[PDB]
Design a protein around this ligand. Structure first.
Ligand SMILES: [Cl-]
Length: 345
RNA sequence: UGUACAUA
C-alpha cells in the first residue's frame, strides 16, 4: 500500500527511510521497485539502527525471500554490514532449509554470499547442512557454485567431506570430471585443497586419464592437474602423452592437453614430446608431419614451435622440411605452413 | 582449420 503509493512517484518520497517500511518488508522486498529502495537505503545509510529496524522482519520472512527474484538481493545485503551476532541470526533463519536452498537459482546466491562474508564457525554450520546433499549438490546447475564457494573460502580441513565425496566411489571423479558442473568442483579442489587431499583425487584421474583427457569437460580437469599437480604428476602425464602423441594430438579435446603440457612443461618435458614427434618409424612419415595434416594436431605442432627451445625447434625443422610442399597440398596447409614461416626463413 | 564456466 505504501508500496503501491511509493511506486507512483518514487522521487516524490525522496525522504523515505528504512524504518518507515517496518510492516511491509515482505511486499517491498519482493517488488522490483521496492527491493531497489531497500538496497539503495542499506548502501547509503550510515545508521545501524535504521538498518536493523527491518532486519527482524528480514529474519522472520527469510525463507520466503531467499529464492525470490528480487528478495534474494535484499537478504544478501544484510550480510554486508554485520559481525558474528548479526550474521548468526541470518544463518539461523535459513540453516534448516540450506539443503534445498543450495539447488535453487536465487537462494544459492544467498548461500554463496554467506560463505563469502561470515566467520569460519558460521561457515562450518552451513557446510554441516550441505553434508546431507553434497553428491547431488556438486553436479547441480546451481549447487556446484555453492560447493565451489566452499572450497575457495573455507580452510581445507573443513571441506574434507567434499574431497571424500569426490572419492566416495571408484567412478566418482570420472563422473564429476565429465559433468559440466561437476568438473568445476574438481578444478577448484585441485586449486585450493591440500596435497593430502589432492593426491588421491589426482590418483583417480590418472586411472581413467585417456577418457577424461578427451572429454569436452574432463580436458580442463587434466589441464588443471598439469598446472596444480605434483612434479611426478606432470612426469606421468607428459610420459603418457609422449607415448601416445599422435592419438592425443588428433582428437578434439585431448589436443588441448598436449598444448598445456607444452605451455607448462619444463625443458625435459618438451624434449620428450618433440622426441616423440620426430621419431620416424622405418616404414612411415614422421609423426610431426602427419600431425601437420590433421584438423587438430596441426595446432599442436604450432604450439610446439612456439614453446620449445631453439635446439628443439631445429630438430623439428630438420624433420619437417623434407616434406613441406607435400603439406601445402593439404587443406589449410597454406595457412598452416605460413604461420610457421617465422621458423623456416 | 579446433573446447566450457549461472540471477533484476
Ligand atoms: Cl533453477
Amino acid at each position: 500500500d505504501l508500496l503501491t503509493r511509493y511506486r507512483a512517484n518514487p522521487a516524490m518520497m525522496k525522504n523515505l527511510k528504512l524504518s518507515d517500511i517496518r510492516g511491509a518488508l515482505l511486499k517491498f522486498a519482493k517488488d522490483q521497485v521496492g527491493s531497489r529502495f531497500i538496497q539503495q537505503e542499506l548502501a547509503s545509510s550510515k545508521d545501524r539502527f535504521e538498518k536493523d529496524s527491518i532486519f527482524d522482519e528480514v529474519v522472520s520472512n527469510a525463507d520466503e525471500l531467499v529464492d525470490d527474484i528480487f528478495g534474494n538481493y535484499v537478504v544478501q545485503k544484510f550480510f554486508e554490514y554485520g559481525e558474528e551476532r548479526h550474521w548468526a541470526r541470518l544463518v539461523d533463519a535459513i540453516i534448516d532449509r540450506v539443503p534445498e536452498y543450495a539447488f535453487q537459482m536465487y537462494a544459492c546466491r544467498v548461500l554463496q554470499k554467506a560463505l563469502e562474508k561470515i566467520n569460519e564457525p558460521l561457515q562450518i554450520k552451513i557446510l554441516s547442512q550441505i553434508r546431507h546433499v553434497i553428491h547431488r549438490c556438486m553436479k547441480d546447475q546451481n549447487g556446484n557454485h555453492v560447493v565451489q564457494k566452499a572450497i575457495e573460502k573455507v580452510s581445507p580441513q573443513y571441506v574434507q567431506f567434499i574431497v571424500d565425496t569426490l572419492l566416495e566411489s571408484s567412478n566418482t571423479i570420472y563422473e564429476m570430471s565429465v559433468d559440466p558442473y561437476g568438473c568445476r568442483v574438481v578444478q577448484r579442489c585441485l586449486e585450493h585443497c591440500s596435497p593430502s587431499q589432492t593426491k588421491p583425487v589426482i590418483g583417480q584421474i590418472h586411472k581413467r586419464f585417456d577418457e577424461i583427457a578427451n572429454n569436452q569437460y574432463g580436458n580442463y580437469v587434466v589441464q588443471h592437474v598439469i598446472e596444480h599437480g605434483s612434479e611426478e604428476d606432470r612426469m606421468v602425464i607428459v610420459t603418457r602423452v609422449s607415448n601416445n602423441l599422435f592419438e592425443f594430438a588428433t582428437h578434439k579435446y585431448s589436443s588441448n592437453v598436449i598444448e598445456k603440457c607444452l605451455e607448462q612443461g619444463a625443458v625435459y618435458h618438451k624434449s620428450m614430446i618433440v622426441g616423440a614427434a620426430c621419431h620416424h618409424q622405418e616404414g612411415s612419415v614422421p609423426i610431426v608431419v602427419q600431425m601437420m595434416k590433421d584438423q587438430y594436431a596441426n595446432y599442436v605442432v604450432q604450439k610446439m614451435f612456439d614453446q620449445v627451445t631453439s635446439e628443439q625447434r631445429r630438430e623439428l625443422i630438420l624433420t619437417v622440411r623434407p616434406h613441406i610442399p607435400v603439406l601445402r597440398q593439404f587443406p589449410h596447409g597454406k595457412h598452416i605452413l605460413a604461420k610457421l614461416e617465422k621458423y623456416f626463413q
